[PDB]
């Protein structure tokens, strides 16, 4: 049998009992990276649970950064939203549609939580621009290299003209405008980025020596972002083209793995809460039917020799779940979020053990530290099949998954 604990206050950030969460201190001990999952995007109970566990990890375990599925320039605008107590400091002016929908309630809660608690937290973007629009990365790169390697400002500029066509506000719309370029131009862009990355890597010893050592670090981060953005656009154009080779979806997660890895050693004092989907936080291959859909970011991260990565998945016992529907014409993001039947709970489901251990009407929290018949877990409206004792450290379960209010 397992270690479980009913947590009644879990869905109430304001009125929280931290003793309910003492179950988590064994695995939060000597961890520097902990992922707060979500069985599906856009779920209100999952934002509530995320805020409560954020407040727990912060106030009892000194976590000082939050990782988001947004590019690092998106994240720096969110940190402007956070610290600004100025007039009309609304989130709609420091976020984009998809960021707003994925993270809105959490971000509003966090802004008001740090203004009411004096604590300060470091927002970090661990993802590509979640719009897959490379313009910001390209423009900031051009501004850095004009100082540290002006001789290849032309190429950068031409690159941004070559990619100016990629202005979507979602992954799918920029994907569609990427499939609209003829392939000679796609290849021109990809090869030009690889050439840039190699010149910069090779000149590093002298480019570090101009202005500040950190401008080269930022230029390399921007180039990494762009390279993986273009390769995600390609991989996705082939997903809706039937040329999608098994496993390609691992690429974006690998980027995020790298981004987390490279940052945590660089600032060895950072304890980072990660807000990312269950499939990204997972530590084993993501498989819905036995195929290898992706190596998740967390599998890479579990290979960190320091063994200080923990993954806490979030799931629910509800009958419905918000689900993304493609396409949704006219919708700002090229998809819509519709209430759809969750995947059925079966005898090999984590959720069926949750029913048979905690009940159906109080949120639950358990360790995976025990052999178990549970092979499966809800993800979006489908399910993943995996060893759940090695895919996640913990499992938070809530009775139901309702659409978070502010997504539209």
Residue numbers in the entry: 10 to 417
Task: Give verbatim lines from the article.
One of these resistance mechanisms entails the enzymatic cleavage of the macrolides’ macrolactone ring by erythromycin esterases (Eres). EreC is an extremely close homologue of EreA, displaying more than 90% sequence identity. Crystal form I, determined to a resolution of 2.0 Å, has one molecule per asymmetric unit, and crystal form II was resolved to 2.4 Å and has two molecules of EreC per asymmetric unit. The major lobe makes up the greater portion of the protein and is composed of 8 β-strands (β1–6, β9, and β12) forming a continuous sheet, surrounded by α-helices and loops.
Most of the EreC structure is effectively identical in the two crystal forms, as is reflected in pairwise RMSD values of 0.25–0.41 Å between the three crystallographically independent EreC molecules. However, there is a notable difference in a loop between residues 295 and 303. In crystal form II, the loop is directed away from the rest of the enzyme, and we have called this the open configuration (EreCOpen). Not unexpectantly, electron density corresponding to erythromycin could not be explicitly identified in either of the two structures. We selected a water molecule present in the close vicinity of catalytic residues (H50, E78, and H289) that is conserved in both the open and closed conformations of the enzyme, strongly suggesting it is the second substrate in the hydrolysis reaction.
